Swiss-Prot record:
It is found in: Plastid, Chloroplast stroma. Belongs to the RuBisCO activase family. It comes from Nicotiana tabacum. Its main location: plastid. Keywords: ATP-binding, Chloroplast, Nucleotide-binding, Plastid, Transit peptide. The lineage of its organism: Eukaryota, Viridiplantae, Streptophyta, Embryophyta, Tracheophyta. This is Ribulose bisphosphate carboxylase/oxygenase activase 1, chloroplastic. The chain holds residues 127 to 419 of 442 of the full protein.
Amino acid sequence: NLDNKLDGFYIAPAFMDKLVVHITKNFLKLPNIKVPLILGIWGGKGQGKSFQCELVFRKMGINPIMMSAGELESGEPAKLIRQRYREAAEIIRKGNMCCLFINDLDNNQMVNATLMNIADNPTENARVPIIVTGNDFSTAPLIRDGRMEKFYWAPTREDRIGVCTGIFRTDNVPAEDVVKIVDNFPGQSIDFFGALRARVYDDEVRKWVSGTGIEKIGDKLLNSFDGPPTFEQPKMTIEKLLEYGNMLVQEQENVKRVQLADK
């Protein structure tokens, strides 16, 4: 029900209600319900699950306290959680909303255990909603049973079109156009479409290069007084898009071939 578009970007309104509400819930004292502190987000493969989070956070003006998984690998594993919690908490405990956004997973006995002890109370303290992302939250079990929420994000076709409109806002493309390609290219990531749009730019440069002297480029590009030759953004027309989309798919399908046949 709440407004899910943001700086030309789209947000899956199921994903939004889940996160927004998970968050605002942990700031309230609402009667006779145990509110889970941490919300673990899984699924939404190909779709920008982390990016959706970022989107939501900006939409509330939360500068989350980020963390990486590679950081929680390399003292660090336990400590850095407590400290990154406290950091967020001190933000919240000065004012304005904050949350600890822990991101990605695929040592662990501990990382769990620190969650469990931290889930049991604040501990001067503070109340900070943790958000986590992964693939599937395996062996969470004791804190799912206890005090955490798993959330499988099943994006719609609607969500894909939305995320996809995001990618092309810049190039003023019919809502129609976006619908045709997404439909035309099912089970492809958002990475696919980024790649597609980038492939159109690429080609233009390739034409420029090939055109205006491979040998005499570094100059026209550097030791010129008029600067680099400032490029005009290529019109992202539909037939362009389709041609490029199959092209990329053939290529994909081909790397799979050379991969499995070399292996």
